[model samples]
Target: EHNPVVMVHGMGGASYNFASIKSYLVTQGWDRNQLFAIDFIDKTGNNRNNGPRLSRFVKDVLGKTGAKKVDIVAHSMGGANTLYYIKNLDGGDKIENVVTLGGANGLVSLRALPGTDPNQKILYTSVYSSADMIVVNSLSRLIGARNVLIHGVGHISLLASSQVKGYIKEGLNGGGQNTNLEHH
Candidate 1:
């Protein structure tokens, strides 16, 4: 029973960003169809302003695939997006084995940063990077529960970083959530 894996990207990103890794996973014998990748759900809109998109994705993924639950690997502003969905939209249920790569989860000065929220809680496991220019400071506080660390992965490059992949594989091996992972 090989559980499926879902890949969710952060702001200004899309399914294409994961191309290399997706190929790697496939070569490694992971089922290509079982590996799901998502683009920014907001499209042209700000995902921050549209809170429901997160939940909607949760439901869309779950309902469309009927996989029960899946692991999440997010990066950059994607981390924050994933957290918003998990804490508020998913209720920490729909998504199991959460992993944030350079997620701006801890609001790194959003007061002036347009199209962002200063106070948002992510509530999940995260792979924070000390060298992440986008998600400065410790990302552990951004999402509680479980956390991993990569010393120098940048905000954008984490999608292919070895450390980031390790975290995702670990989460998949650990088995994703069962608390419903319900967002829609």
Candidate 2:
């Protein structure tokens, strides 16, 4: 049995933002019940404020699935928000893997984030596009993470790109590092 997957949308976005990706996962053999997308009441709120809410959602997901941990896929600001939950809310214990698309993780350092400790056993994969003008590509990289840089994909398009889908699949399957797309 696979760990459930959680989708976290960016600032101003709702659970619907993950529609295409969720469907894509299904086509790749993930069960509908195994994929969950959370809707934040304050879509544009601060990441710190949203962190606790994400923690609650994760707890609910685990409670329903009876899974020991879950995989998280976040977009834009949701990346930092996910990190905040793992760091400040003790969410690391319940996370198996993490993936971020055009993430705004540069707002804070991974070293400052609590879950990065090797002991946590959480794997991270960050996929960013050079064509993204909204959040610079550099902002998506996390220390010790599998940092990938796509040449022509845009910020929002990262969720729908077939190439990104491959990376996401690889990440969730426990093999993302050392790919040709990896940027150092």
Candidate 3:
């Protein structure tokens, strides 16, 4: 079944990033009625923020539209928050599949600031650039945790790069994307 898909914006980002992707998904026959996006501007960096953010969005969308267990597409820092929200927080109750674009699976070196209030742990795909200085490739390779790296891709290329469309298409379809995570 084509599950409802929710897009999560990264830090310093809003739902606009997924505009093209969402449209593309609709064109690809992904049911626009099922696509949704989340922006947790209030306390977004807090590990706890992801839960309420996800729960409320899920409740609102699912309750209003009567859809259940939506797919998740998260990017950058939102990847970490999204993972923790689905696994530790949501208890895998609301997520059907996760598509993370430039996910920060490990740590970011961009100086999260002294009080940025970031979660230390996260899960799922850590899409990285081999040359990404902001978020080191090693950051995503922690235990080789379900990663995908476009060798020359830069960090901000998501909004500028056209190649991401294919990745997004495949990830949501659960066909081309690969995960190193050793699921027990």
Candidate 4:
């Protein structure tokens, strides 16, 4: 099993934003303590400022869990922050996997896809909705990781979808995306 899963909220969000998702993970047999959510301020979409802070947060999660690495699940701007941290801030070594919800993948220009990075053997899953207004232009697509597309849901609603939670579970279990839910 991977280390504790860290839940990173999007811009202008806090830990409270993940309450429903956390509850869903709990139903999937994850203990409350095994899930960690972070609160941050990212009004400027500046990964440089958020990356180091997030790196430290992952370190703290690892320290608290006594695990070598962690699984990250982020939303919106949180995804860009994570990409920046893993690629530029040297955070790949501390991660086991990443699952992003409407992640702003367009925010980062790195060509390396998730899990294929030579720096670390991290797995990744990018989940986004076709109706997401936040990440317009299909910008949430992550080239390397498995991308799961859900139709009809908006950006924030993606976080609360049971289908998205199922995909997250599959990603953590080393399984492929549940393509049955894919639309278009």
The lDDT leader among the candidates is 2
Q: Write the per-residue lDDT of candidate 3 for residues 74-127, one digit (tens) a residue.
A: 777766676566545552555555666676655432211111112211223445
Name the candidate that leads on TM-score.
Answer: 2
After superposing candidate 2 on the true structure, give the runs of residues whose Cα lies further than 4 Å from its correct spot: 111-120, 176-184
User: Cα-based RMSD of the predictions, in order?
Assistant: 7.7, 3.9, 7.1, 4.8
lDDT score for candidate 3 against the true structure: 0.61
lDDT against the true structure, per candidate, is 0.58, 0.80, 0.61, 0.77
TM-score of each: 0.71, 0.89, 0.75, 0.88
Put the candidates in TM-score order, highest first.
2, 4, 3, 1
Which scores higher on lDDT, 1 or 2?
A: 2
Model 1 bad stretches (over 4 Å)? 41-45, 48-50, 107-124, 140-144, 175-184
Residue 172 shift from truth in candidate 4, angstroms: 1.4
lDDT by residue for model 4 (1-184), tens: 5569888888888888888888998888888888888877666657877888798888888887799778888999888888888777777678777888999877783332443245446667888888887786367776556778889988888779989999988877765332222244
lDDT, residue 112, model 1: 11
Query: For residues 4-29, what per-residue lDDT tens digits would candidate 2 score against the true structure?
Result: 99999988888888888998999999
Instruction: Choose 2 or 3, whichever is better by lDDT.
Output: 2
Which consecutive 10 residues in model 4 have the weakest lDDT in total? Answer: 175-184
Report clashes for each candidate as comma-separated counts.
5, 0, 0, 0
Q: What would the per-residue lDDT of candidate 1 be over residues 1-184, giving only the tens digit for each residue?
A: 4456667676667878888677766766778887777766565425464346656666777787787665566666666666556545543556545565666666532211111222322224566777777666564334224556668667777778876776666655652222222343
Of the two candidates 1 and 3, the one with more favorable lDDT, higher being better, is 3
